[PDB]
């Protein structure tokens, strides 16, 4: 389990998780606030 969590802490895994989180956040924002051109 400790080794498994270390594997989940590897650069590629963290990147996939972090980028999936960031992409999701941006998508959801555009899903609830569509066509945002200006502040």
Partner 1 sequence: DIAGLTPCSESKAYAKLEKKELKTLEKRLKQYEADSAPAVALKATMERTKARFANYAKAGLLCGNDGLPHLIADPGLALKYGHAGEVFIPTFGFLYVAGYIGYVGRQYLIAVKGEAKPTDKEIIIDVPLATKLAWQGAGWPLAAVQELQRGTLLEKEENITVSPR
Partner 2 sequence: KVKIAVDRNPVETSFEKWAKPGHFSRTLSKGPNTTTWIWNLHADAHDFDSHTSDLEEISRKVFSAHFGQLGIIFIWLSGMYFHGARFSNYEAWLSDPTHIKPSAQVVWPIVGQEILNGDVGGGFQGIQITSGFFQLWRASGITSELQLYTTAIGGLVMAAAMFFAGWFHYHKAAPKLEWFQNVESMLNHHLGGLLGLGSLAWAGHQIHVSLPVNKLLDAGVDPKEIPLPHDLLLNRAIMADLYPSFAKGIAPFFTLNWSEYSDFLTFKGGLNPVTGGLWLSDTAHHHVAIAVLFLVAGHMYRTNWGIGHSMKEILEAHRGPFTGEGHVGLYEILTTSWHAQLAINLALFGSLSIIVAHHMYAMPPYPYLATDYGTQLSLFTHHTWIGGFCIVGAGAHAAIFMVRDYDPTNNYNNLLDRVIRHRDAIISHLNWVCIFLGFHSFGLYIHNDTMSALGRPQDMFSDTAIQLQPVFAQWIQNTHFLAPQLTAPNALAATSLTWGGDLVAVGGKVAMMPISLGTSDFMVHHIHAFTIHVTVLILLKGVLFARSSRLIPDKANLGFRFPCDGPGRGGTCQVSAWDHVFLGLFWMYNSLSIVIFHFSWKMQSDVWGTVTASGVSHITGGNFAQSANTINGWLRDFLWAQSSQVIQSYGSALSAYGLIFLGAHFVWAFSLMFLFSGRGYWQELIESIVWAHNKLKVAPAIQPRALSITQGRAVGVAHYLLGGIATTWSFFLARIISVG
Kindly list the residues in this chain that would bind ligand CLA in the complex (CB under 6 A).
Answer: 25, 29-30, 35-37
Q: Name the residue with tokens 């080794």.
A: 3
Residue 7 in contact with residue 13, Cβ under 8 Å? yes
Residue 15 in contact with residue 22, Cβ under 8 Å? no
Interface positions with partner 1 (CB under 8 A): 6, 9-11, 14, 34-35, 37-39
Nearest distance from C-beta of residue 12 to ligand CLA, angstroms: 9
Site of interaction with partner 2 (CB under 8 A): 1, 3-4, 6-7, 10, 27, 30-31, 35
């Amino acid at each position: 389990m400790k080794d498994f969590t270390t594997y989940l802490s590897t650069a590629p895994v963290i990147a996939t998780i972090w980028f999936t989180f960031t992409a999701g956040l941006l998508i959801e924002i555009n899903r609830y606030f569509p066509d945002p051109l200006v502040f």
